[PDB]
Amino acid sequence: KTFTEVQTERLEQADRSVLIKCPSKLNEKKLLQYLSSHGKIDNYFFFENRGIHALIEFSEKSSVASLQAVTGIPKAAEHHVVPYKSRLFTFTLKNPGSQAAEERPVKISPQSHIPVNELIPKLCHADSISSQMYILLNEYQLTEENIKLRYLACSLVRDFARAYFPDSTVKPFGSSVNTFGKLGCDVDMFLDFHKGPFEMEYQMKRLPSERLATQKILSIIGDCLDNFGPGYSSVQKILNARCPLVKFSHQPTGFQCDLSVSNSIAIRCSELLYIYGCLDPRVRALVFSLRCWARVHGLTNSVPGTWITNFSLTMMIMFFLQKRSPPIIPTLDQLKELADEKDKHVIGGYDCSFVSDLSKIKPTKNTETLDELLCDFFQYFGNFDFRKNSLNLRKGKEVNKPESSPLYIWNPFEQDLNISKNVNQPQLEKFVAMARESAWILQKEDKTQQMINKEPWGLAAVLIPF
Amino acid sequence: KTFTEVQTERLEQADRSVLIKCPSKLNEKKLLQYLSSHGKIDNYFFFENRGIHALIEFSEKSSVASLQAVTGIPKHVVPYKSRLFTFTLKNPGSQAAEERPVKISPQSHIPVNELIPKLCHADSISSQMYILLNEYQLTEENIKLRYLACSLVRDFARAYFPDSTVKPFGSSVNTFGKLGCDVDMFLDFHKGPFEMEYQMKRLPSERLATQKILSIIGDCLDNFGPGYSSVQKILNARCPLVKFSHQPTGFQCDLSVSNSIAIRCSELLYIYGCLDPRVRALVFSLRCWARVHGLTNSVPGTWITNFSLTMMIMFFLQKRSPPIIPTLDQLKELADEKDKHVIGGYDCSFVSDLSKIKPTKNTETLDELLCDFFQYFGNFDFRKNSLNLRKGKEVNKPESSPLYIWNPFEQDLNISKNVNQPQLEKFVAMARESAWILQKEDKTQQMINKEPWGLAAVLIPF
Ligand SMILES: Nc1nc2c(ncn2[C@@H]2O[C@H](COP(=O)(O)OP(=O)(O)OP(=O)(O)O)[C@@H](O)[C@H]2O)c(=O)[nH]1
Ligand SMILES: [Mg+2]
Ligand SMILES: [Mg+2]
């Protein structure tokens, strides 16, 4: 299945889904038996976040309308509430003293990964380094339940926008959908907004220039999220940034969210990364471990600045994997060649085209183990000449740097842009030093003796401070 | 019919109506012949406001949908699809054609200067006040245009709040509306073992919710909705408010969240206006009188408001021998359990059926009532007495405000508390001068001398 098919299918599923704040005492079967009267239920689950919440995915969207019909406005807060009716519900018993079935406990689907301290033991008790990186991956990656919750959050924000742009969509991009998302990560959202003798037309208010329109639209949705709600808080409008942005927390799901107007270049990146992530499990294994490594050594940071970003790091990892013998993943120009007329995408002059079908890509013949790749990553970039060379992911080669920035990574979809232009000399040097130390640790450590000594080894040794 | 029946019927008609900005050259018949293919047309008319517009009222609401189906988006824009259309000739340069002129229904009254001659050529003062009334009152076409404006804001509000209604109140629907007046709008909201409810953020008061709602709709009207301009948010007033101009209709509009006290006032005034034509005749002439003498003003302040003046006129009419209109307490008595309306402890109940009210036996002519209005309030002790419209009597003033008129639906509120001593005194003086002019003028000699007389004499500056 292609990225685009997965997006559509996930959004269509979210479109016919709701959230129900459950009561203290909860009989799952009765609730589901009741909710099913409004229509068939394809999927559901429960999770914990300031109480027990449940996601309900109906087979028909009409089921949502049916359920909405019988739902009421909090009688306890009559004229004291903003009567905006969304898909967030709060179920309570009609006759509290008529609970007629055995109350069982419910299975709570986890929405956050276990912390680093708890992860180290599990890594240390693994057999090899490969397995360590697969433990980490499995502990960290997004669950099916979490993904559905992310798409639903998008779907609730969409409903606000459509009020006046009926054909709009709010689509997740970035780590949420590029296969490299870890539990607890932000949800990045793109708003995408576009016979007689008389020529008949609607009267419609015109919009200003692209940027100014984006700012007003995002400002108003921000205001709505803040005031029409429910569950949105810490709504922070950052409309003056290069890319206008609204940040907000969504309390029912517990996500932190970023909303901007659609940038089709950024979506192609997400699809590019999706392909790379789907082509081979080692790709995702390496990313998750190296992201974690960077965070632990203070190379990355939650606030923008001179630090390397996960996006940049992720791109450096793809470049590494492009330069193997033989390559674990193909280059972008190779994917452009395989791209037929169905997959052609030009976005402001530059050809952002590449294949969508995974079948067309021949599998790699590379059989290197993660053990070798992790150390070689550190080895490779530890001894990389960042002053003379830059990273081109189209060619998959080291080339001369168009600009004199310390760390230059060629933006694969735009001609002379550097995705890591923010990075200064100090931060790059610290990365190189951490990379070199990490390689040294791995190359010349006694793995067996450290297991005996009950001390860190392999991935675990590079995931603790120096 | 009752106020409520009229509201529903007008809103149902507006619900299945649209506006069409017509082309320069216009063949009415062809256009209507075309539009009728989408369904039957109960009513239509044309008017003039930065070009020719036409209101089309279909018999079925489905006709709107049919028409909407074939309509296209301007080939940029906020693609909000409402009921405002822009028809143009497919082939402009192949028509005469269409040089047939159309009847323009007027949406504003003729100015005061043009009105004086018509008043001076009347037979009596009664007829003068009926000329003025007829020249000024809302037309059927204008009323439909007002209800339509409400209906478009409703759809527009409904984007976020599907169960909303937008209802006109005030002068638009209390029978005392004159052409060119504002359109006041109230935004109103109306199996198994579980009691299911929405999750909604709790706000400390209705007030704070009202402000946020109106602020967002304002922003949308400004940035998304078509034909709205001069959107002015006044959320800090006693009643939160958004003002805006609606360019297609040319109305100035005021939008607030439903205040049921204000609607009862509108219905109260509707009853009084419907009980007798003299009531409406007196209001329109005395409103015009106040405006001409600078007693009233378009901007709030120390001036008497039309609402206050209108209330003073009702009080006058309550105190006739016999009364031309009944008191509020009399209407409360006749109000059955069907018409009971308590709002905030205070009983805002009164009859809705006009049949239950016995007609007045008063046969006084407008001639006498106009002069007696001036006479009555000219010699009224405003320092000792206040106006109670429930009792219909002069009573001691609960507060020491210069002009005290008892708010009929709320306890110890003064609708004219804004009025100071200077402005009241000027009113009393104008009232006294106006009475004197009328009492001791030679009506016949002034007609001979080609000069003002009667109502016309009190509608020119002194
Ligand atoms: N009780 C009370 N109601 C008021 C007051 N001012 C305005 N209103 C209400 O608000 C409504 C609209 O006010 P306006 O639009 O200023 O006046 P109007 O009665 O519509 O008549 P115009 O002056 O022709 O617009 C009125 O019908 C009143 O019910 C006040 O001081 N007291
Ligand atoms: Mg993110
Ligand atoms: Mg008005």
PDB file of N, CA and C and ligand atoms in Angstrom, chain B residues 146 169-172 177 181-184 252 254, ligand 3:
ATOM      1  N   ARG B 146     -34.884  42.110   5.552  1.00  0.00           N
ATOM      2  CA  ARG B 146     -34.361  42.076   6.914  1.00  0.00           C
ATOM      3  C   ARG B 146     -34.293  40.652   7.429  1.00  0.00           C
ATOM      4  N   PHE B 169     -35.021  41.429  16.320  1.00  0.00           N
ATOM      5  CA  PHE B 169     -35.823  42.017  17.380  1.00  0.00           C
ATOM      6  C   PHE B 169     -35.753  43.537  17.238  1.00  0.00           C
ATOM      7  N   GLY B 170     -36.348  44.260  18.180  1.00  0.00           N
ATOM      8  CA  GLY B 170     -36.342  45.717  18.146  1.00  0.00           C
ATOM      9  C   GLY B 170     -37.212  46.277  17.035  1.00  0.00           C
ATOM     10  N   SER B 171     -36.835  47.448  16.534  1.00  0.00           N
ATOM     11  CA  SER B 171     -37.667  48.201  15.605  1.00  0.00           C
ATOM     12  C   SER B 171     -37.977  47.445  14.309  1.00  0.00           C
ATOM     13  N   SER B 172     -37.115  46.506  13.917  1.00  0.00           N
ATOM     14  CA  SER B 172     -37.349  45.703  12.711  1.00  0.00           C
ATOM     15  C   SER B 172     -38.667  44.928  12.753  1.00  0.00           C
ATOM     16  N   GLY B 177     -40.654  50.224  13.191  1.00  0.00           N
ATOM     17  CA  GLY B 177     -39.472  50.376  12.355  1.00  0.00           C
ATOM     18  C   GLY B 177     -39.709  51.321  11.195  1.00  0.00           C
ATOM     19  N   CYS B 181     -33.489  52.000   9.222  1.00  0.00           N
ATOM     20  CA  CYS B 181     -33.110  51.672  10.591  1.00  0.00           C
ATOM     21  C   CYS B 181     -32.254  50.406  10.633  1.00  0.00           C
ATOM     22  N   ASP B 182     -31.469  50.274  11.699  1.00  0.00           N
ATOM     23  CA  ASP B 182     -30.632  49.091  11.924  1.00  0.00           C
ATOM     24  C   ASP B 182     -31.435  47.793  12.000  1.00  0.00           C
ATOM     25  N   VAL B 183     -30.765  46.681  11.703  1.00  0.00           N
ATOM     26  CA  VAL B 183     -31.326  45.348  11.906  1.00  0.00           C
ATOM     27  C   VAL B 183     -30.675  44.740  13.139  1.00  0.00           C
ATOM     28  N   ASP B 184     -31.439  44.665  14.227  1.00  0.00           N
ATOM     29  CA  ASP B 184     -30.968  44.056  15.472  1.00  0.00           C
ATOM     30  C   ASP B 184     -31.215  42.546  15.458  1.00  0.00           C
ATOM     31  N   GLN B 252     -27.368  48.267   8.141  1.00  0.00           N
ATOM     32  CA  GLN B 252     -26.428  48.278   9.223  1.00  0.00           C
ATOM     33  C   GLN B 252     -27.027  47.273  10.216  1.00  0.00           C
ATOM     34  N   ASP B 254     -26.755  44.760  13.907  1.00  0.00           N
ATOM     35  CA  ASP B 254     -26.270  44.606  15.271  1.00  0.00           C
ATOM     36  C   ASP B 254     -26.567  43.187  15.737  1.00  0.00           C
TER      37      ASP B 254
HETATM   38 MG    MG C   3     -33.170  48.713  15.083  1.00  0.00          MG
END
